[PDB]
Paper text:
For the levan utilisation system, the cell surface components are Bt1760 (a GH32 endo-levanase), Bt1761 (a surface glycan-binding protein; SGBP), Bt1762 (SusD) and Bt1763 (SusC)15,19,24. SusC proteins are unique among TBDTs in that they are tightly associated with a SusD substrate-binding lipoprotein15–17. The SusC transporter forms the barrel of the bin, while SusD sits on top of the barrel, opening and closing like a lid to facilitate substrate binding.
To visualise potential different conformational states, we used single-particle cryo-EM on detergent-solubilised apo-Bt1762-63. Strikingly, several distinct conformations of the SusC2D2 complex are present in a single dataset, and after further classification steps, three dominant states were identified. This yielded structures corresponding to the three possible combinations of open and closed dimeric transporters: OO (3.9 Å), OC (4.7 Å) and CC (4.2 Å). With the exception of a few Bt1763 loops (L6 and L7) and the Bt1762 segment following the lipid anchor that serves as a pivot around which Bt1762 moves upon lid opening, the conformational changes between the three states correspond to rigid body movements of Bt1762. Interestingly, the presence of the plug domain in the interior of the Bt1763 barrel in solution is strictly correlated with the open vs. closed state of the transporter; only open states contain a plug domain, regardless of the state of the SusC2D2 dimer. In the open, apo state of the SusCD transporter as observed via cryo-EM, the Ton box of Bt1763 (82DEVVVTG88) is visible, tucked away inside the barrel, and interacts with the body of the plug. Hinge1 and 2 change conformation substantially during lid opening and are responsible for the majority of interactions between Bt1762 and Bt1763 in the open state.
Numbering used by the authors:
A (entry chain A): 1 to 552
B (entry chain B): 134 to 1016
C (entry chain B): 477 to 575
D (entry chain B): 330 to 378
The structure:
Amino acid sequence: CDDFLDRQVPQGIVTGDQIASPEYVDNLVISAYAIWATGDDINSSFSLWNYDVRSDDCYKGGSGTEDGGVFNALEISKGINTTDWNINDIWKRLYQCITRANTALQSLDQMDEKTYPLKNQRIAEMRFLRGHAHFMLKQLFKKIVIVNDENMEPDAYNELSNTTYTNDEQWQKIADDFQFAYDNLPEVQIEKGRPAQAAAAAYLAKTYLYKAYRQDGADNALTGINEEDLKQVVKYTDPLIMAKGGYGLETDYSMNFLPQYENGAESVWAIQYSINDGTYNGNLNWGMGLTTPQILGCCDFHKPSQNLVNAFKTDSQGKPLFSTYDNENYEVATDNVDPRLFHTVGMPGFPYKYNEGYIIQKNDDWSRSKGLYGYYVSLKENVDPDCDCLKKGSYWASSLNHIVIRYADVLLMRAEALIQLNDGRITDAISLINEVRSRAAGSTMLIFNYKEDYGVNFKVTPYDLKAYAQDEAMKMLKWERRVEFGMESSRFFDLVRWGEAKDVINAYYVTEASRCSIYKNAGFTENKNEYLPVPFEQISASNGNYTQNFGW
Amino acid sequence: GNPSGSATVRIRGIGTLNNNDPLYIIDGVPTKAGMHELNGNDIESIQVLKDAASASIYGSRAANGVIIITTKQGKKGQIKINFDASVSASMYQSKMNVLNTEQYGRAMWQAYVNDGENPNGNALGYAYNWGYNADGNPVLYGMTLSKYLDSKNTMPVADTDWFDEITRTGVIQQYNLSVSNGSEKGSSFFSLGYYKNLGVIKDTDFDRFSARMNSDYKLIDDILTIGQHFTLNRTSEVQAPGGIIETALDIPSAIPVYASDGSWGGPVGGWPDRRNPRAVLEYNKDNRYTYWRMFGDAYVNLTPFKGFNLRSTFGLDYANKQARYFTYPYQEGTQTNNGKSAVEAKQEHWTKWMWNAIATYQLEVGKHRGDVMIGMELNREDDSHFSGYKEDFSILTPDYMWPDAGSGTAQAYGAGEGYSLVSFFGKMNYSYADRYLLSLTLRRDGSSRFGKNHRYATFPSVSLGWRITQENFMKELTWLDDLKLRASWGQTGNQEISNLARYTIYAPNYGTTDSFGGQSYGTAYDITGSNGGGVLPSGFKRNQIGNDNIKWETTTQTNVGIDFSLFKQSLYGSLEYYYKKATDILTEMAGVGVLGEGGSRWINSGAMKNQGFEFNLGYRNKTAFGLTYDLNGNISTYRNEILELPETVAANGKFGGNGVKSVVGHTYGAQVGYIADGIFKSQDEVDNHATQEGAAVGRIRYRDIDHNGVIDERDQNWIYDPTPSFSYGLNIYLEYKNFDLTMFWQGVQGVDIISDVKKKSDFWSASNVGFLNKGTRLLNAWSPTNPNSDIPALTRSDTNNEQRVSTYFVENGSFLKLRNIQLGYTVPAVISKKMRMDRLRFYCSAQNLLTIKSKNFTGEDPENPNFSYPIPVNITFGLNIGF
Amino acid sequence: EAKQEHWTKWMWNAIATYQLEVGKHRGDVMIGMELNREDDSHFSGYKEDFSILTPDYMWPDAGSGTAQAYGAGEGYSLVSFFGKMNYSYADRYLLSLTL
Amino acid sequence: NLGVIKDTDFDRFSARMNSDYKLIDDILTIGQHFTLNRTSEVQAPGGII
């Protein structure tokens, strides 16, 4: 009676043989999409928002002094342990998204082209998500194990190493799926959630431009910069393929960071957060669950630094002060400023998210730490409290659809490609960064009524059409990337990409020791503190198949 | 002392890391759950098959030993009828002593003057008049309380006895009735029952109704026999809440049981957040459940020619359980459930049924007998449950709060499980001389939770025994009567693995359920950028991952035993020795790294081994005094070891040592901690000791093991193993003329326990929240005035880390307590026979009357030192009418 | 929807009959009381918007949509007293009275 | 029973135990009657004819 034994089916769940069936697809791809919106802790966001407080721009926003503890050890670059838990958490949280993308790809083998004409598009989307998470993890650790095959059994996930692939091979295996997405993605998707041709082009440009800066050995120091792939960089950023699809520059810098219109022309590929959508509290941005200040009740994390505010202050010519800015306290009432100051950071005596009833003061209701971190708030990821955006399921979160890739990003990367190629075509990159500066100048249409009641002066005067020096234009574009990408988790990775990161961080430490009390004892050693270390538990469990980062 | 009387049973010590309840068998049909709801008075014999070579026949699932129960039957030519009764009383004896308001103020003053801070600047309503003596020590002169507890004068102050407030004397009733029958062609039996228990803790109870019908009918010269066994119960228990003894210990005694009006009092300010326990018992009053249960059996016997029987039974086991759990709004100072009302209406269902067809043979030729039998078996379990939920009700009574009279949000739950089994077995017997006994079994079995690689499992067994006194070379030893050797070797292994151990579960998880912290592993993802509307698409996340090579947890157990009988059938008893070794224990391991979410694969690797002795004895002899005694007794011995544990599961300490030492080599559950050997009595202990972190005039010293100034985490050793030697018991029976006395004694010697009332009763600040009530042992702590106590000083903050595991929290758990003593009085012959009845009795008994312990235990009950349901003293005054 | 209903009745009665035969007359008088109690019930559940469509996946935990719950409860009681009589007097004239 | 209209049925299991025992010259008599059923019916919908 063997047939009596195979008669019971498990209840309330779906097992693992009908999950590979061709009719239960267009569920695993949405499941692989959904890990980016939900699936992160408030201590570890997928925007890489807490792992860059050591990047001369954030005071970590401590309510207490050591309430996170290991975050303060991360922001001081002294005393971080290999057995810390934030590192293992971000490792596991990226490999979960890798797991979902690989399971969706492994299910997408068994389809045909007779009734299903969208196999290439869905494989391109899943490969794009896998390559994006791998590119983020390579930004974090830079010595990681890459799984690329979809038909790999769980018996041999343990028997995998990261020393089998050196750095150019790892960047090429990251570039594989992005180039395959550029092969088979459509130009315009009707729904704004799915990526398009321009997103694959921008990520191929990112992967190639990080492949360009050669590493060549166990030391994480800069060597001879390769020029070979720069032709592919400038090929994969040509402006007609970004015009195809309508992805252009918006009218205001304060447009994309405003929830009354989410998807615009700068939104290349956003992360869709929503509210009142059937679930318990809504797919809200729970990663920024601590960034809201002391108006709503908690938790005043992630306050911007004074050095970024002094980097905003321009002169009466309309140009950034080249390393003569930190000597004086930047004040709008004295000299000319940049108008993106009021977009990114809220100053005392100014409306919070353009609300006249919430003028910022310096009392206890804007910082739980009295003078340990100052009185600053962030407006890049916070909204006004009269939103429907906010809902307090023990934490105040916004429904602003967070954007990872913008048109200004691919523009400045194209400018970096043209200046690093430097084969006669220098002045067109100067014209492009002049267009970006002119867009930044003609972007003020919301706070320009504050000249009467406060008294302000701002002007961004673009430069002329002349091929300048190489290093001068390098410093100009680095200043522009610093002033445009404030509080958007794109500073530390660019410092370690350019290589010159330890000296400027040590200069920030010795100039901010007088500003904060904790920064009096600081230090950033060479060739050890650039990347985060590989967590100890994975090395212990791998039985030596893994390896350690250099200097650890 | 739970009124349901449930019991945690282990046979031959601990056998497996996960679940190891034994397998009960009630009239052929098995069930692994119950026996505190079954009628415990229709009992004919209780075999306990402790072995594995004798219990290998009954199943793979007999790794933990099987307890064979049978029920009564009709005797030939009798029509008897009994009628039992009892009316009892339960009294409380094991109350932990707590400190009241004056000692609470004295302890607070002592802590604040050991700080040096002014004690009058406290948050509570206390006034201290004190000063400095000439010898430097502060002396408290006067202490004065306030009148109310807050400024608004809502709660008065009092001295409430909490363990006298939630405790009552609880009556216990009992009834019975039993009618039998029996002829040369049929038999019958028909019982009844009732048993009502009201617990010593207020507003908990239990009551069970019962019935039973048994019969059999043999038709044609014993070639056709049909019979049946049936049971029907109904239990109805109100359950005690979670942590009601600990809450009765925690709350300070100054809080009154009532407010200024009729509402309940509470900690209105400064006092720590602990709910009023009388309110917890008054609101958990009508969470009553109701549990029905049926059995079944229908065996059909058939003998074709002679000495050769057939059989075909059919079991049945149905049981449902209906509940309705309320929650209420409350308000006690700051303790408030925010005005929330709800009702959950659960329902569960179970169903089993078996079928088996054995066929035995029996032959006797020469001086040889044998019994061979073969047969198959079937099983199927079909469990279920579901639920409901509503919110925000208007009137607050247990009959208005049905889920239709609500307004708020609603939810629903439910699941379903399953099981199957099919097997084949066999047995043999042999004697050949009435000297050399031998038996061989073999059972091939395959369940529905085993992996796809192998369905059917095989379980062999060999057992042999041979007598001594029937050998003719031992006839010169005449005072001996019987002596039997025995030895056996079996191999069984259970299959209580999870139902989804081979399946690679995928689950939807839309995200409607709640997750704090924003983890929320959902599958919604709004596309088209709608940002609104509940019409989002859905998908599947992975729950866990299963291997296809799962396998049962096999144990290979040997045995060597010796029987004896002496002195014209007296001094009977046995002597056994055993050695078992389980070889494949299941441990679920987390998926390493790149496996991502859902890496929990169930694998089977691990091994334990147990060995020990058993020795029972009994002396029955009538003396010349006009008296008859009987003294049964038994002494056991137990020793455990874990052979090997696979991976880092041995490191973090799910089973044994607390994450700092490996468990492999030692026993199971052994904790590893520091060694505390005394107090810093003198001043020169700060430099006589070696580099202590927290060193004061209290602050117990920890010995160095490396002797290198080590107060690191490298000085822990194995301090506690819970497997005692020398467990024993003794039953004593007396028979004077027209009287009878039955006593009992039970105990165990050399037990270590981990007391957590000692942490509550020896330290002022060891728990998380402050100003909790304690136990009144710490009022005689160390002081400059009293240097003659081992209790450490009363500090306000945990300066030196005293909450570590250490030898200060290990007591001697050895005891010896009288379980019951019962005196009866049989009414004599002619006075009973004048009333047309057989036997009459008016007995009296009392349970748990006394206990004796060691010096090394400052507590109240050596069985359960922690916060469980207490053990009360019963006193019974019953009778036994027998017609 | 996962319904569930429950019913429960129980009675108790204690009659006491008498029987006599003298001459050519027989009679049977009996008296007794009676009790009753009915305790009905039901409840339910509801879920919505399931993914796979089979009778074993569609348990109320594998859903996503809105949910409801129902339930009620009823009752009854009774208590009475009765009586009966018989008569024949000749095996000719039968008579019976109840109340 | 399997109905003439498709996909409707009915099935019933049953049991019964009856007994009585008279003890002392018919002055004491205890008896009982017990039944136990299980029916399982798939119902025809409303307005299928």
